[PDB]
Design an enzyme around this catalytic site. Structure first.
Site, PDB file in Angstrom:
ATOM      1  N   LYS A   1      -5.004  -9.889  -7.254  1.00 39.19           N
ATOM      2  CA  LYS A   1      -5.784  -9.145  -6.253  1.00 39.19           C
ATOM      3  C   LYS A   1      -6.864  -8.303  -6.943  1.00 39.19           C
ATOM      4  CE  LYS A   1      -5.259  -6.633  -1.954  1.00 39.19           C
ATOM      5  NZ  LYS A   1      -4.274  -6.027  -1.031  1.00 39.19           N
TER       6      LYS A   1
ATOM      7  N   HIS B   1      -3.011  -2.290   8.172  1.00 37.52           N
ATOM      8  CA  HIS B   1      -4.145  -2.653   7.354  1.00 37.52           C
ATOM      9  C   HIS B   1      -4.625  -1.369   6.684  1.00 37.52           C
ATOM     10  CE1 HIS B   1      -8.140  -4.069   6.168  1.00 37.52           C
ATOM     11  NE2 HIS B   1      -8.666  -3.071   6.862  1.00 37.52           N
TER      12      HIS B   1
ATOM     13  N   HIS C   1       0.779  -1.252   0.000  1.00 37.53           N
ATOM     14  CA  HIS C   1       0.000   0.000   0.000  1.00 37.53           C
ATOM     15  C   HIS C   1       0.806   1.296   0.000  1.00 37.53           C
ATOM     16  CE1 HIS C   1      -3.677  -2.282   0.419  1.00 37.53           C
ATOM     17  NE2 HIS C   1      -3.242  -2.853   1.529  1.00 37.53           N
TER      18      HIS C   1
END
Length: 121
Positions: free
Chosen positions: A39, A113, A12
């Site tokens: 993904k 996350h 990310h």
């Protein structure tokens, strides 16, 4: 142990991206190991790491829903969305560049996350 933070950065974070077009998405998704299987959706945050880590504190964050954090600042981001019916490579991606705050979960002051739900559309 801070392996989840390291994995967060791999999935990310991209400091200084090269033109955030479809070909950008197709390349970075391969480079970061996210193509076997493909993904479905994945967002990269740009700029410096320290601003992202700050979401975990009052400095750049607020509590959000059930134990998430939402940033005060806005970030340059790019969302890579899979197209075609197949889950398997080659993985074709459509890129959507954007500029807004982000939602993360934090552990020991580090992001672990990214909440992808805010980038689905």
């Amino acid at each position: 142990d801070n392996s989840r933070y390291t994995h967060f950065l791999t999935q990310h974070y991209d400091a200084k991206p090269q033109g955030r077009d479809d070909r950008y998405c197709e390349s970075i998704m391969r480079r970061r190991g996210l193509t076997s299987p493909c993904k479905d959706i994945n967002t990269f945050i740009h700029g410096n790491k320290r601003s992202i880590k700050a979401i975990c504190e009052n400095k750049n964050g607020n509590p959000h829903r059930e134990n998430l954090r939402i940033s005060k600042s806005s970030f340059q981001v790019t969302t890579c969305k899979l197209h075609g019916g197949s889950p398997w490579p080659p993985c074709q991606y459509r890129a959507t560049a954007g500029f807004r705050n982000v939602v993360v979960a934090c552990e020991n002051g580090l992001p672990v996350h990214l909440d992808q739900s805010i980038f689905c559309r």
